[PDB]
Design a protein around this motif. Structure first.
Motif, PDB file in Angstrom:
ATOM      1  N   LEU A 154       0.863  -1.178   0.000  1.00 31.70           N
ATOM      2  CA  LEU A 154       0.000   0.000   0.000  1.00 31.70           C
ATOM      3  C   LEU A 154       0.899   1.228   0.000  1.00 31.70           C
ATOM      4  CD1 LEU A 154      -2.846   1.291   0.178  1.00 31.70           C
ATOM      5  CD2 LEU A 154      -2.669   1.127   2.673  1.00 31.70           C
ATOM      6  N   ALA A 155       0.799   2.030  -1.056  1.00 38.48           N
ATOM      7  CA  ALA A 155       1.698   3.162  -1.253  1.00 38.48           C
ATOM      8  C   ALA A 155       0.906   4.428  -0.969  1.00 38.48           C
ATOM      9  CB  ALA A 155       2.248   3.178  -2.674  1.00 38.48           C
ATOM     10  N   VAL A 156       1.415   5.259  -0.067  1.00 37.85           N
ATOM     11  CA  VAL A 156       0.647   6.416   0.394  1.00 37.85           C
ATOM     12  C   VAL A 156       1.495   7.673   0.456  1.00 37.85           C
ATOM     13  CG1 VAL A 156      -1.045   5.087   1.707  1.00 37.85           C
ATOM     14  CG2 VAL A 156       1.112   5.806   2.808  1.00 37.85           C
ATOM     15  N   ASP A 157       0.823   8.816   0.474  1.00 37.97           N
ATOM     16  CA  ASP A 157       1.504  10.095   0.596  1.00 37.97           C
ATOM     17  C   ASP A 157       1.461  10.564   2.047  1.00 37.97           C
ATOM     18  OD1 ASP A 157       2.709  12.530   0.129  1.00 37.97           O
ATOM     19  OD2 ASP A 157       1.281  13.158  -1.422  1.00 37.97           O
ATOM     20  N   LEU A 158       2.297   9.982   2.907  1.00 43.25           N
ATOM     21  CA  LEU A 158       2.362  10.348   4.334  1.00 43.25           C
ATOM     22  C   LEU A 158       3.797  10.260   4.865  1.00 43.25           C
ATOM     23  CD1 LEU A 158      -0.742   8.294   5.685  1.00 43.25           C
ATOM     24  CD2 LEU A 158      -0.697  10.782   5.280  1.00 43.25           C
ATOM     25  N   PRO A 159       4.173  11.149   5.802  1.00 38.54           N
ATOM     26  CA  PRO A 159       5.551  11.110   6.303  1.00 38.54           C
ATOM     27  C   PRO A 159       5.831   9.861   7.113  1.00 38.54           C
ATOM     28  CG  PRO A 159       4.250  12.631   7.604  1.00 38.54           C
ATOM     29  CD  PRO A 159       3.359  12.176   6.483  1.00 38.54           C
ATOM     30  N   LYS A 160       7.114   9.550   7.263  1.00 40.15           N
ATOM     31  CA  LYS A 160       7.590   8.442   8.080  1.00 40.15           C
ATOM     32  C   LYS A 160       6.899   8.390   9.434  1.00 40.15           C
ATOM     33  CE  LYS A 160      11.614   7.247  10.915  1.00 40.15           C
ATOM     34  NZ  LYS A 160      13.103   7.230  11.038  1.00 40.15           N
ATOM     35  N   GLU A 161       6.819   9.536  10.102  1.00 40.18           N
ATOM     36  CA  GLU A 161       6.268   9.542  11.443  1.00 40.18           C
ATOM     37  C   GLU A 161       4.815   9.036  11.454  1.00 40.18           C
ATOM     38  OE1 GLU A 161       9.874  11.703  10.976  1.00 40.18           O
ATOM     39  OE2 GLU A 161       8.032  11.808   9.801  1.00 40.18           O
ATOM     40  N   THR A 162       4.045   9.372  10.417  1.00 39.83           N
ATOM     41  CA  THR A 162       2.656   8.945  10.351  1.00 39.83           C
ATOM     42  C   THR A 162       2.564   7.449  10.051  1.00 39.83           C
ATOM     43  OG1 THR A 162       2.099  11.121   9.418  1.00 39.83           O
ATOM     44  CG2 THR A 162       0.360   9.459   9.447  1.00 39.83           C
ATOM     45  N   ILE A 163       3.422   6.957   9.160  1.00 46.51           N
ATOM     46  CA  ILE A 163       3.466   5.525   8.874  1.00 46.51           C
ATOM     47  C   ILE A 163       3.624   4.773  10.199  1.00 46.51           C
ATOM     48  CG2 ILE A 163       4.780   3.642   7.790  1.00 46.51           C
ATOM     49  CD1 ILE A 163       3.296   5.555   5.771  1.00 46.51           C
ATOM     50  N   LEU A 164       4.541   5.245  11.028  1.00 49.23           N
ATOM     51  CA  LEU A 164       4.748   4.631  12.337  1.00 49.23           C
ATOM     52  C   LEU A 164       3.481   4.595  13.200  1.00 49.23           C
ATOM     53  CD1 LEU A 164       8.336   5.908  13.051  1.00 49.23           C
ATOM     54  CD2 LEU A 164       7.643   3.500  12.743  1.00 49.23           C
ATOM     55  N   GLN A 165       2.682   5.664  13.150  1.00 54.07           N
ATOM     56  CA  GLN A 165       1.441   5.716  13.938  1.00 54.07           C
ATOM     57  C   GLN A 165       0.458   4.639  13.503  1.00 54.07           C
ATOM     58  OE1 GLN A 165       1.117   7.494  16.644  1.00 54.07           O
ATOM     59  NE2 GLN A 165       3.188   8.249  16.211  1.00 54.07           N
ATOM     60  N   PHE A 166       0.428   4.360  12.206  1.00 52.84           N
ATOM     61  CA  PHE A 166      -0.472   3.343  11.681  1.00 52.84           C
ATOM     62  C   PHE A 166      -0.220   1.931  12.216  1.00 52.84           C
ATOM     63  CE2 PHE A 166      -2.018   6.495   8.781  1.00 52.84           C
ATOM     64  CZ  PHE A 166      -3.271   6.060   8.432  1.00 52.84           C
ATOM     65  N   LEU A 167       0.962   1.695  12.788  1.00 53.38           N
ATOM     66  CA  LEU A 167       1.292   0.390  13.365  1.00 53.38           C
ATOM     67  C   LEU A 167       0.549   0.104  14.671  1.00 53.38           C
ATOM     68  CD1 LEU A 167       5.184   0.288  12.666  1.00 53.38           C
ATOM     69  CD2 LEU A 167       3.254  -0.450  11.250  1.00 53.38           C
ATOM     70  N   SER A 168      -0.168   1.093  15.192  1.00 58.41           N
ATOM     71  CA  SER A 168      -0.971   0.900  16.403  1.00 58.41           C
ATOM     72  C   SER A 168      -2.355   0.298  16.086  1.00 58.41           C
ATOM     73  CB  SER A 168      -1.145   2.224  17.164  1.00 58.41           C
ATOM     74  OG  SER A 168      -1.932   3.147  16.431  1.00 58.41           O
ATOM     75  N   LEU A 169      -2.668   0.163  14.800  1.00 56.35           N
ATOM     76  CA  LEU A 169      -3.940  -0.437  14.393  1.00 56.35           C
ATOM     77  C   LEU A 169      -3.994  -1.902  14.792  1.00 56.35           C
ATOM     78  CD1 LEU A 169      -4.689   1.189  10.914  1.00 56.35           C
ATOM     79  CD2 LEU A 169      -5.451   1.899  13.208  1.00 56.35           C
ATOM     80  N   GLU A 170      -5.161  -2.351  15.241  1.00 56.88           N
ATOM     81  CA  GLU A 170      -5.296  -3.722  15.704  1.00 56.88           C
ATOM     82  C   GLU A 170      -6.209  -4.475  14.742  1.00 56.88           C
ATOM     83  OE1 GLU A 170      -6.368  -3.702  19.895  1.00 56.88           O
ATOM     84  OE2 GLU A 170      -4.703  -2.332  20.286  1.00 56.88           O
ATOM     85  N   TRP A 171      -5.603  -5.286  13.881  1.00 56.01           N
ATOM     86  CA  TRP A 171      -6.324  -5.972  12.808  1.00 56.01           C
ATOM     87  C   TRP A 171      -6.370  -7.471  13.035  1.00 56.01           C
ATOM     88  CZ3 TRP A 171      -1.715  -3.189  11.805  1.00 56.01           C
ATOM     89  CH2 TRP A 171      -0.565  -3.977  11.824  1.00 56.01           C
ATOM     90  N   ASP A 172      -5.935  -7.925  14.205  1.00 63.95           N
ATOM     91  CA  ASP A 172      -5.871  -9.358  14.475  1.00 63.95           C
ATOM     92  C   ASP A 172      -6.794  -9.790  15.623  1.00 63.95           C
ATOM     93  OD1 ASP A 172      -4.372  -8.039  16.358  1.00 63.95           O
ATOM     94  OD2 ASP A 172      -2.503  -9.127  15.995  1.00 63.95           O
ATOM     95  N   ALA A 173      -7.752  -8.933  15.971  1.00 57.25           N
ATOM     96  CA  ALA A 173      -8.765  -9.280  16.964  1.00 57.25           C
ATOM     97  C   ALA A 173     -10.149  -9.322  16.318  1.00 57.25           C
ATOM     98  CB  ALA A 173      -8.727  -8.284  18.129  1.00 57.25           C
ATOM     99  N   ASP A 174     -11.079  -8.508  16.812  1.00 55.23           N
ATOM    100  CA  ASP A 174     -12.390  -8.384  16.172  1.00 55.23           C
ATOM    101  C   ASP A 174     -12.559  -7.006  15.547  1.00 55.23           C
ATOM    102  OD1 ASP A 174     -12.685  -6.877  18.477  1.00 55.23           O
ATOM    103  OD2 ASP A 174     -14.219  -8.160  19.364  1.00 55.23           O
ATOM    104  N   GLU A 175     -13.728  -6.737  14.971  1.00 51.56           N
ATOM    105  CA  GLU A 175     -13.917  -5.484  14.251  1.00 51.56           C
ATOM    106  C   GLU A 175     -13.949  -4.293  15.198  1.00 51.56           C
ATOM    107  OE1 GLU A 175     -17.067  -5.404  11.272  1.00 51.56           O
ATOM    108  OE2 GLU A 175     -16.729  -3.244  10.991  1.00 51.56           O
ATOM    109  N   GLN A 176     -14.416  -4.535  16.419  1.00 52.66           N
ATOM    110  CA  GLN A 176     -14.522  -3.474  17.404  1.00 52.66           C
ATOM    111  C   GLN A 176     -13.129  -2.951  17.748  1.00 52.66           C
ATOM    112  OE1 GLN A 176     -17.219  -1.836  19.067  1.00 52.66           O
ATOM    113  NE2 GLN A 176     -15.415  -0.558  19.484  1.00 52.66           N
ATOM    114  N   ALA A 177     -12.173  -3.861  17.899  1.00 50.96           N
ATOM    115  CA  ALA A 177     -10.803  -3.471  18.217  1.00 50.96           C
ATOM    116  C   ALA A 177     -10.200  -2.664  17.074  1.00 50.96           C
ATOM    117  CB  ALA A 177      -9.959  -4.677  18.529  1.00 50.96           C
ATOM    118  N   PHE A 178     -10.446  -3.094  15.836  1.00 47.67           N
ATOM    119  CA  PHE A 178      -9.965  -2.312  14.702  1.00 47.67           C
ATOM    120  C   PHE A 178     -10.550  -0.911  14.756  1.00 47.67           C
ATOM    121  CE2 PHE A 178      -9.491  -0.665  10.404  1.00 47.67           C
ATOM    122  CZ  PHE A 178      -8.173  -1.009  10.126  1.00 47.67           C
TER     123      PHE A 178
END
Lengths: 119, 123
Positions: free
Chosen positions: A45-69
């Motif tokens: 996934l290629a996006v127009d966002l700085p390094k620091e923001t890419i790092l923030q996206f790693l806090s997303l929780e995609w391995d539980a249920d939809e509520q956690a996401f």
């Protein structure tokens, strides 16, 4: 049962150390079991966002249920200036990681030439 | 067995010409070649590393770079440590991550806070 090790700031007793080892093994059982429901595909996934923001996206929780996401999306979006673009980025991550279950997603900033892998 | 063309999605803040979209695709497919190639260098092992650090610190550790040089790893360690209060423990944690991710080439490492009950995966 994966290899496990505990590294602690202060000396640990044998019993404290084994309790942590069992505690974490147990809390991860489900996640590990689910690990194989994932497809071996690789996407980018290629996006127009700085390094620091890419790092923030790693806090997303995609391995539980939809509520956690949804909760982690809400938290992420509330901590960054309001922008519909961020939400669209999260939507695509949801489609890729949750709906299509792809194990390896490269999240890459074409602005900054920086990537992190969402596993 | 030499050049891999992974599926790619370009998501832009504003409409993208077909030519701009193409340029971005080639850029990312090219820049990732080395990384993708060394992806089969990783062992199938899973490991867990349990630490007494809060969620916020766990998230910071996700900036470490373990898929290239020992040099590139050590650079990210210095940057990580320079932005947190001085503590021998942090470096000790970094050392174990180096051994697991770089030396042993473990593909899936669960970095787990036994204080906050919070993990992230370093792949």
């Amino acid at each position: 049962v994966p290899t496990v090790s505990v590294i602690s700031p202060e000396k640990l007793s044998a019993s404290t150390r084994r309790r942590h080892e069992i505690q974490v093994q147990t809390r991860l059982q489900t996640t590990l079991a689910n690990l194989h429901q994932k497809s071996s595909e690789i996407e980018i996934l290629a996006v127009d966002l700085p390094k620091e923001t890419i790092l923030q996206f790693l806090s997303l929780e995609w391995d539980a249920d939809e509520q956690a996401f949804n909760t982690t999306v809400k938290q992420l979006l509330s901590r960054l200036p309001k922008q519909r673009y961020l939400k669209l980025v999260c939507d695509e991550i949801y489609n890729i990681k949750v709906e299509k279950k792809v194990s390896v997603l490269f999240l890459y900033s074409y602005r900054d030439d920086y990537y992190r892998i969402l596993f």
